[PDB]
Design a protein around this nucleic acid. Structure first.
Ligand SMILES: Nc1nc2c(ncn2[C@@H]2O[C@H](COP(=O)(O)CP(=O)(O)OP(=O)(O)O)[C@@H](O)[C@H]2O)c(=O)[nH]1
Ligand SMILES: [Mg+2]
Ligand SMILES: [Zn+2]
Ligand SMILES: [Zn+2]
Lengths: 69, 57, 778, 289, 57, 49, 121, 196, 129, 44, 66
RNA sequence: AGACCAGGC
DNA sequence: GTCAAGTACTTACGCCTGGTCATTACTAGTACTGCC
């Protein structure tokens, strides 16, 4: 739903790389191979988190019960 | 399950220091038996394993 | 260059702000157009939708006084217009109730049903038009009577629904019910049928017969079966209530129009006068009618005989003469898809149906397989919802006569012209039709006093799960054959037949007891839901070489018959008939012709030796099965059907085109598989029972049902916490918006015997993966 | 075998051991005598000619060449005349009279030899309303006989009538036997398999068939003629070769008791509600169905 | 992979005693009604074939 | 222990018990599964005490 | 018993009925300008720079193997130019059956499949 | 489950023999002469007569299946184990197939050599009313591929018209699994009550 | 080859009727030709009379919106032909003996057993006991 | 045996599967029993 | 007006009576009430061959093979 | 306790 | 007395889990209200 802290297979902290990854794809126009490599994701167990994370919490957060719309 | 009809219950949440590990440093997080393949002939799961790992690299 | 791609920068942007214009992923909405577009067709369209046309077929029903040899006053009561309103709530001025509010109340999202009556007296002295609300009718979501109709995915979020939320389902008592599709015999086409159960009708019944399933313009059905007798004659068969009737057809042939007795001979026999099989079996028919019925020598005397017999069971009034109730037999039973003012066209089709039955017993034809999807048609669930709405306002229009039946019998204070008398009797009848529809959706049972033209009686509604989005999209593509066929120890109805190429998915079928019976569509198979044009097509068949059906004297397999939607347009030879099957195909794809639609199905059956009955059959009506294909001269999209497909050579890939034998090619060889069958990766490498398991298990996964889970109130719901998009995925995965609904996790899977705890089918997980949130769900 | 005790078996057979002395050519020509020949199997086509105006039928029927059917079926020209005379017209009259009752709801000259007039005179004498008969006495190619009706009768088909009587008229039928086939010798022994069970009629062919080695398929037809213990032996050998096709090994101690339970009364009792009506325990019968 | 909805927690029904049926005094059908599993006809005869007879009773 | 369909008599046997501490599932050895005809794709099977 | 507008024709035109002359019933679609035509094949022809297919339909109104099977009886005017009668010229009290039936019909060329542009390697 | 470059050359040259098997088997059944062309009007007349009968089409589909299964045995006995890239005992696929751990030789035949003839209820793939077996094939062709003989291993993959024939045989195994046990379970139910 | 055309009769001159095989009539039986001036979708009515029959016909207004039948009279010595724009009329023979035969208006339970099912008859045989 | 959806009489509470002999005498629900999914286990 | 074993009326197409179930010299139409003589209705002749599939045999199968 | 529906092996 | 043609009748794998639905018309009565 939101970015997983501490990837599943080895245990490297991964959860802080998500918003830097969207920076390294949008502002600095890099492909997904370089942008995972610059974030220190060398093992492919780490590399399949940030590559394939859906980040579906942004679709959840548009249903706010505590504000008029 | 996989996406190729390879269903099966979990059997023991096997501890990390008792799992196989690579020269890369990783350890898998699902072990599957190879004997579930030849009677079932789900080679689309074998070629997904190449296509998955070549994709994440 | 990427061979495929996830779009991270696009799918994150579409999560932040949904599009203020029309929705992205429009291919997801084309998978529910058979459900949405059928409910639209019963409310709007030509002639006021398919519920105003179903009112007109019920007509006027009368009941007389006992006040004095006239009977009294007529009371020609009727309905003339039914209309559905959008759901509104009453808290003074009415507010718009949105179905988010209806899920939380655990009520039924339903709109107002408004019938207006026609309380006529004395054949038109005065009329009392009074609009009467008949309870809350359950409206389905994202139709033209739902408030989610023309909403953007931005505005669907602001009304709490979901961004790419497809409708297609009814909310009944807070439960998202859903009416299934049903596969059934094609309309307007008499298929020659061999059944051993045709011989149990009585004495000397053969096993040969023919069977047309006509449909009225309000999508209500009626069968008309001809049996062959070994005595030498034939026998019509129908059913009005839930019981059968058996008429000799020469009575029906002499009732439909004014006939010379050689017209019955000239219609069956063409120029093959020297055919001794066909003459001698026809000797028994006409002499056997003059023997049994020595009277009845013109049209108006046959018609009074047939009206007197079926008078007491058609609930005919004491007003109706025997002659005008005889036409009421013919207007509502025999080949009703021509309707009134089609007595000649009903007559020619009967003479066609005799000769096809005489050519069946001669061995010169083959029995048409009723289980093969060549001869199949779809009940859309919306048209079933209009078939049931006709017979609940037919019964309601009869309940207000059974109330002035007792009022005549018991009471006396009766004045049919009084406004307060109408307002007193209508407070005594059960007007609540919307509860009789909500009972249908909540239960599935089909309570009708005139049991409809389909076999089963239960299981018409199934709870749409929303247990997974793969499960939820699968309810809108599933096709069930019937509950008659499940409780049946045969095998040949469950087989995968090659006529289902690109219509039924070969893979997506549940293992176990519903195998072969419940099966889904290929994803490009779309169902026609509205009447395509017919009107200009005979004007551009007569100039092409067809001599018309009123100046012909032709029948039999030696010629070919030209039929647009079940009526004979004319007669033409086999050699010319194949030219104007190919010329209309070139003219319907080249869309410069103003009368041939692209959505037309031109089924040409070439002449053979003891094969199917030859003839050119054009179909353009509702409820057909259609799929796109690419036509090789002037490369464009051509839209074909199952009856059409079994005589043309479409090639599966543009490299296997062979010289001068192939006409079409598929756009891709992936539009034969279903929604769920295209999403399994490298499907052409698995054993086929293992591809059929992923279609079953993959829609049983713990995934994400939606994102409106704060505003849902469903009794059980499975949500997986952190889902991912796959590395290995088909290009249809990113096309149906399946990134909106993750279902699993890219797991580092080691194919190894290492453990001993995973041998037979078992598997194990890393422990400290599951300590880190691997595969978590609530 | 087990559940229904079907004496009306779906496909009865019979194994006939050929002797070690008689020839293989002496077998596949011997089976042409046992295997039945319908009158359907010799007729090319039947051309009727109905005349009216005193309705009168001309039932002309065309065979094949005598060098063609007597080679295949070994049917003489004289025997084909008797089946028409003494089997076919008698069954044709049994259907025409059956209908008229219930409807009330190229060739040579004639005087070649007077035995043709005499043989015509018997058919007019013995039958009901046949007024002519002739048979191809030099080639056997055609038979032709008139058939008269009155004007009271409505129209008969008399082709569908004539066909079905040709399908029921038999040239040379051994009773309850349809076809005798000579397959290849499976595991040494010479074997002749028929498509019908009649042990009495196969006891006449001593010189061709070993009569003391005839096993069979129908476990009730061998119960009728070879006593009880041959049906007990047939039921084991017919239930052994249903596990032998599928290569399933099940021992002869289970197949013995299922045999001996089904023949425990001397008759052949199934395992169903009919075969258990002869039993002491009433709650066992009240538990089954 | 995929996680299916067939968890163990919708299983592991166990009964020592509990509610009984009214007109038979037999255990009740159901996991949620805290009832027993059935030993039907196909389990009864296979409990005769061992020759054990106190296990049948 | 017992597993449906109880076709032959060796689909309903008698076992000793070793009580295991962790999770809510029965633990069967592989030699027994040839005679119960049991795979581990979600088979459940009875336990009569 | 005459419905609305159905005016009865007072006077009619010529019909010269006497290897002799033969009566042809020829079909035309409604979009054919018959008011100036000169040729007719036995095949195809040209009308307004467009080809039309022409066949022989003798074996529908009659048969090609059997005499006297005609149905379309021709109506001719009387010996008054005032009313219509059955055609009769043989003193047999039988209608004058048609000999040759020509059916002018539309046709259009389907292009052949270009095997070099759709068979992509 | 790969084969050598020598092995696939063996495989793809025995499968070239199957390009004329469906016509030689058709001309044997219909009793026309050998070396008749596949578009012979005398052949196409009698093949249409074979389709209309159930019993005459049972022997067309039995002689042709008897020959394409003889092509199958030539492929498997040459390519296995002699044309395998990794051999026994290092070949983990064939090690658990020879030793009976899990699988069979007919399974590794479909994985590594040839998927084979797709058998229906004793027959080949069922035919339409027109004579086509599928819309991809011309009406009444004497090709072995058109009657369900597929030449694609699971390692390389099956063509979309071979995939649809493999779904017919796959469903039939699931239909006999589900509904036909109601016929055998009542056999043991009748057999036990008498013998209890 | 080729066929030459002399003239085209643009007026209603002759017509075509199609009854059945073997339709004859006495020679005094003459016919009537009717016409309403629409555009060139003409709709005619045939009417005729002898003592004991009526001969009435009509055009097929559903099929004459695109057809145009023409009768020709060909000289085989020449190649010339005339063209007569003649309609083709659906026609029928109306009798006079059985024309106005009619029963009553309303002939004042078991009545639906002439057209009933094979076990509908067996159940009402039980209803008489 | 009674002409008339219908109400089950006292014969039909005995006859078939879902009767009394087959459903409640030849096979019964039992106490002291469990049922759960199985997982494989060596070291047993 | 004679096709097969049956006859029709020349004036309205009605199926006439059986000419041997009706008395001498006259056959009357039941709708026109026009009368045809019994002469010109001399004999009703009809040939009817069996359907060339009605007799399946081993010897029939050798017809097209040879 | 049933009727139906959805399943699991 | 013997043999039929047609009927009437019974069967149809085992176990396990979830959900939903469930009598309708009417008829006479007591009470509400519009009325003079
Ligand atoms: N008596 C019944 N047994 C069944 C039924 N359904 C499943 N089963 C049992 O469950 C098992 C199901 O096996 P499958 O259908 O999956 C065939 P499959 O090749 O997938 O088995 P594996 O090779 O073990 O995976 C099988 O052993 C059956 O004995 C049923 O309806 N009736
Ligand atoms: Mg299992
Ligand atoms: Zn990692
Ligand atoms: Zn007449």
């Amino acid at each position: 739903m939101i970015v997983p802290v501490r990837c599943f297979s080895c245990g490297k902290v991964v959860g802080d790389k998500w918003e830097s990854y969207l920076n390294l794809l949008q502002e600095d126009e890099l492909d997904e191979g370089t942008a995972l490599s610059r974030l220190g994701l060398k093992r492919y167990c780490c590399r399949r988190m940030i590559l394939t994370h859906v980040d579906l919490i942004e679709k959840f957060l548009r249903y706010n019960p505590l504000e008029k719309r | 399950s996989s996406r190729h009809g390879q269903k099966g219950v979990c059997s023991r949440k096997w501890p990390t220091i008792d799992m196989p590990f690579s020269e890369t440093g990783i350890q898998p997080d699902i072990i599957i038996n190879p004997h579930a393949f030849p009677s079932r002939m789900t080679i689309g799961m074998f070629v997904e394993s190449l296509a998955g790992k070549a994709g994440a690299l | 260059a990427r061979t495929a791609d996830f779009r991270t920068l696009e799918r994150e942007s579409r999560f932040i702000n949904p599009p203020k214009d029309k929705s992205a992923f429009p291919l997801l909405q084309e998978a529910v157009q058979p459900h949405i577009g059928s409910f639209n067709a019963l409310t709007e369209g030509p002639d006021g939708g398919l519920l105003n046309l179903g009112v007109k077929d019920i007509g006027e029903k009368v009941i007389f006084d006992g006040k004095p040899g006239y009977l009294g006053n007529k009371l020609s009561v009727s309905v003339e217009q039914v209309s559905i309103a959008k759901p509104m709530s009453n808290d003074a001025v009415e507010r718009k109730v949105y179905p988010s509010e209806s899920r939380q109340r655990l009520t039924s999202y339903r709109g107002k049903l408004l019938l207006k009556l026609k309380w006529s007296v004395n054949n038109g002295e005065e009329n009392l038009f009074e609009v009467r609300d008949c309870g809350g009718l359950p409206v389905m979501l994202q139709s033209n009577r739902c408030h989610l109709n023309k909403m953007s995915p931005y505005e669907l979020v602001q009304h709490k629904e979901e961004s790419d939320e497809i409708g297609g389902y009814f909310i009944v008592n807070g439960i998202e019910k859903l009416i299934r599709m049903l596969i059934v015999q094609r309309r307007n086409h008499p298929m020659a049928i061999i059944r051993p159960s045709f011989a149990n009708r009585g004495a000397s019944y053969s096993h040969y017969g023919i069977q047309i399933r006509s449909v009225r313009p309000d999508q209500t059905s009626q069968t008309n079966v001809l049996h062959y007798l070994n005595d030498g004659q034939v026998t019509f068969r129908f059913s009005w209530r839930k019981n059968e009737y058996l008429v000799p057809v020469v009575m029906i042939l002499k009732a439909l129009c004014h006939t010379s007795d050689r017209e019955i001979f000239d219609g069956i026999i063409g120029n093959d006068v020297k055919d001794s099989f066909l003459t001698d079996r026809l000797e028994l028919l006409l002499r056997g009618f003059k023997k049994r019925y020595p009277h009845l020598q013109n049209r108006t005397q046959v018609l009074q005989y047939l009206g007197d017999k079926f008078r007491v069971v058609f609930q005919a009034s004491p007003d109706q003469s025997d002659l005008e109730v005889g036409q009421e037999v013919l207007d509502r039973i025999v080949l009703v898809h021509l309707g009134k003012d089609g007595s000649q066209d009903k007559f020619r089709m009967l003479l066609f149906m005799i000769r096809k039955l005489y050519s069946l017993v001669a061995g010169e034809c083959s029995p048409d397989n009723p289980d093969a999807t060549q001869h199949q048609e779809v009940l859309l669930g919306g048209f079933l919802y209009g078939m049931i709405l006709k017979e609940k306002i037919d019964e309601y229009l009869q309940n207000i006569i059974a109330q002035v039946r007792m009022d005549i019998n018991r009471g006396m204070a009766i004045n049919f012209k009084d406004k307060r008398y109408m307002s007193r009797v209508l407070m005594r009848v059960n007007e609540n039709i919307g509860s009789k529809m909500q009972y249908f959706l909540s239960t599935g049972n089909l309570v009708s006093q005139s049991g409809l033209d389909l076999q089963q009686v239960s299981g018409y509604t199934v709870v749409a799960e929303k247990i997974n989005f793969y499960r939820f999209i699968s309810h809108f593509r599933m096709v069930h054959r019937g509950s008659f066929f499940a409780q049946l120890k045969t095998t040949t109805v469950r087989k995968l037949l090659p006529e289902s190429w690109g219509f039924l998915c070969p893979v997506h079928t549940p293992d176990g007891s519903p195998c072969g019976l419940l099966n889904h569509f290929a994803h490009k198979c779309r169902i026609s839901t509205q009447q395509s044009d017919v009107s200009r097509i005979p004007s551009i068949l007569y100039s092409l070489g067809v001599a018309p059906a009123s100046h012909t004297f032709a029948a039999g397999p030696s010629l070919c018959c030209v039929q647009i939607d079940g009526k004979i347009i004319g007669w033409v030879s086999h050699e010319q008939g194949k030219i104007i099957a190919d010329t209309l195909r070139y003219w319907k794809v080249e869309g410069k012709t103003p009368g041939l639609p692209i959505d037309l199905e031109i089924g040409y059956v070439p002449p053979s030796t003891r094969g199917q009955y030859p003839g050119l059959y054009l179909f353009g009506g509702h409820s057909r099965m259609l799929r796109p294909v690419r036509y090789l001269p002037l490369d464009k999209e051509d839209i074909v059907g199952p009856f059409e497909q079994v005589y043309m050579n479409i090639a599966v890939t543009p490299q296997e085109i062979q010289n001068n034998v192939h006409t079409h090619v598929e756009f891709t060889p992936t539009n034969i598989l279903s929604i769920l069958a295209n999403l399994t990766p490298f499907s052409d490498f698995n054993q086929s029972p293992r591809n059929m398991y992923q279609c079953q298990m993959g829609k049983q996964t713990m995934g994400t049902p939606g994102v409106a889970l704060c505003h849902r109130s469903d009794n059980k719901l499975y949500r997986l916490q952190t889902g991912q998009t796959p590395i290995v995925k088909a290009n249809l995965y990113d096309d149906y918006g399946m990134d909106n609904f993750p279902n699993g996790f890219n797991a580092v899977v080691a194919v190894i015997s290492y453990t001993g705890y995973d041998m037979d089918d078992a598997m194990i997980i890393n422990k400290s993966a599951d300590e880190r949130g691997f595969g978590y769900g609530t | 075998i087990v559940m229904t005790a079907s004496a009306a078996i779906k496909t009865p057979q019979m194994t006939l051991p050929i002797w070690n002395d008689v020839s293989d050519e002496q077998a596949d020509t011997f089976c042409k005598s046992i295997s039945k020949v319908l009158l359907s199997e010799v007729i090319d086509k039947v051309i009727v000619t109905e005349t009216t105006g005193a309705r009168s039928y001309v039932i002309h029927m065309r065979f094949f060449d005598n060098n063609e059917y007597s080679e295949e079926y070994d049917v003489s020209k004289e025997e084909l005349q008797n089946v028409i005379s003494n089997q076919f017209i008698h069954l044709l009259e049994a259907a025409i009279v059956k209908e008229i009752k219930k409807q009330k709801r190229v060739e040579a000259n004639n005087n070649m030899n007077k035995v043709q007039r005499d043989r015509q005179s018997a058919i007019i004498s013995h039958h009901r309303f046949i007024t002519k008969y002739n048979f191809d006495d030099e080639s056997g190619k055609w038979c032709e006989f008139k058939l008269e009706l009155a004007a009271d009768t409505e129209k008969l088909l008399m082709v569908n009538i004539v066909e079905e009587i040709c399908r029921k008229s038999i040239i040379r039928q051994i009773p309850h036997i349809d076809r005798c086939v000579h397959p290849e010798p499976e595991n040494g022994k010479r074997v002749l398999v028929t498509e019908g069970v009649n042990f009495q009629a196969m006891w006449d062919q001593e010189a061709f068939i070993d009569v003391d080695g005839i096993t069979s398929n129908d476990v009730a037809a061998v119960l009728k003629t070879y006593g009880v213990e041959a049906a007990r032996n047939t039921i084991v050998n017919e239930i052994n070769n249903v596990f032998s096709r599928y290569a399933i090994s099940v021992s002869f101690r289970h197949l013995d008791l299922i045999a001996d339970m089904m023949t425990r009364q001397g008759t052949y009792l199934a395992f169903n509600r009919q075969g258990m009506e002869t039993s002491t325990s009433s709650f066992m019968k009240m538990s089954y169905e | 992979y995929q996680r299916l909805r067939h968890m163990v927690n919708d299983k592991f029904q166990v009964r020592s005693t509990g509610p009984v049926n009214s007109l038979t005094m037999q255990p009740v059908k159901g996991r949620k009604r805290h009832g027993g599993i059935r030993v039907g006809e196909m389990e009864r005869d296979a409990l005769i074939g061992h020759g054990t007879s106190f296990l049948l009773q | 222990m017992n597993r449906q369909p109880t076709l032959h008599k060796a689909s309903m046997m008698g076992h000793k018990v070793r009580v295991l501490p962790n999770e809510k599932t029965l633990r069967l050895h592989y030699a027994n599964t040839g005679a119960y005809n049991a795979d581990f794709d979600g088979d459940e099977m009875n336990m009569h005490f | 018993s005459i419905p609305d507008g159905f005016k009865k024709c007072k006077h009619l035109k010529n019909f010269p009925l006497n290897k002799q002359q033969q009566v042809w019933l020829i079909k035309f679609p409604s979009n054919v300008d018959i008011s100036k035509l000169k040729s007719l094949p036995v095949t195809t022809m040209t009308i307004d720079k467009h080809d039309y297919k022409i066949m022989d339909d003798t074996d529908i109104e009659s048969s090609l193997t059997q005499d006297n099977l005609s149905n379309m009886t021709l109506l001719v005017p009387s010996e008054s130019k005032e009313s219509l009668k059955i055609a009769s010229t043989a003193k047999d009290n039988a209608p004058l059956q048609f000999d040759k039936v020509f059916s002018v019909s539309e046709t259009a060329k389907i292009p052949a499949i270009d095997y070099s542009k759709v068979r992509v390697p | 489950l790969r084969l050598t470059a020598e092995g696939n050359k063996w495989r793809t040259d025995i499968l070239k023999t199957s390009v004329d098997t469906g016509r030689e088997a058709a001309a044997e059944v219909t009793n026309l002469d050998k070396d008749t062309p596949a578009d012979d009007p005398e052949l196409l007349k009698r093949l249409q007569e074979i389709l209309r009968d159930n019993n005459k089409s049972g022997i067309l589909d039995a002689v042709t299946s008897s020959k394409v299964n003889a092509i199958t045995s030539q492929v498997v006995s040459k390519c296995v184990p002699d044309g395998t890239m990794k051999k026994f005992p290092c070949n983990s696929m064939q090690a658990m197939a020879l030793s009976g751990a899990k699988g069979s030789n007919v399974n590794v035949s479909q994985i590594m050599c040839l998927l084979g003839q797709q058998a229906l209820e004793g027959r080949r793939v069922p035919v339409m009313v027109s004579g086509k077996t599928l819309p991809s094939f011309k009406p009444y062709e004497t090709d072995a591929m058109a009657g369900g003989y597929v030449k694609g291993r699971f390692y390389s993959g099956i063509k979309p018209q071979e995939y649809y024939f493999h779904c017919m045989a796959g469903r039939e195994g699931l239909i006999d699994t589900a509904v036909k046990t109601s016929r055998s379970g009542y056999l043991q139910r009748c057999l036990t009550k008498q013998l209890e | 080859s080729e066929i030459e055309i002399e003239s085209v009769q643009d007026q209603p001159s002759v017509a075509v009727g199609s009854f059945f095989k073997g339709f004859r009539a006495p020679s005094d039986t003459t016919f009537d030709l009717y016409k309403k001036k629409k555009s060139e979708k003409d709709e005619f009515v045939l009417h005729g009379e002898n003592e004991r029959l009526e001969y009435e016909g009509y055009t097929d207004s559903s099929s004459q919106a695109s057809n145009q039948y023409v009768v020709g009279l060909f000289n085989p010595e020449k190649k010339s032909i005339q063209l007569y724009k003649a309609p083709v009329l659906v026609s029928k023979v109306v009798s006079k003996s059985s024309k106005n035969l009619r029963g009553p208006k309303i002939k004042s339970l078991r009545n639906a057993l002439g057209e009933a099912f094979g076990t509908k008859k067996a159940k009402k045989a039980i209803a008489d006991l | 045996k009674a002409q008339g959806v219908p109400i089950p009489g006292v014969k039909q509470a005995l006859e078939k599967k879902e009767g009394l002999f087959r459903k409640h005498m030849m096979g019964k629900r039992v106490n002291y029993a469990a049922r759960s999914v199985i997982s494989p286990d060596p070291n047993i | 007006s004679v096709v097969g074993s049956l006859i029709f009326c020349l004036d309205c197409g009605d199926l006439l009576e059986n000419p041997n179930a009706v008395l001498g010299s006259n056959v009357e139409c039941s709708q026109c009430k026009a009368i045809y003589p019994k002469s010109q209705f001399s004999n009703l002749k009809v040939v009817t061959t069996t359907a060339d599939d009605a007799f399946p045999s081993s010897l029939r199968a050798k017809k097209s093979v040879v």
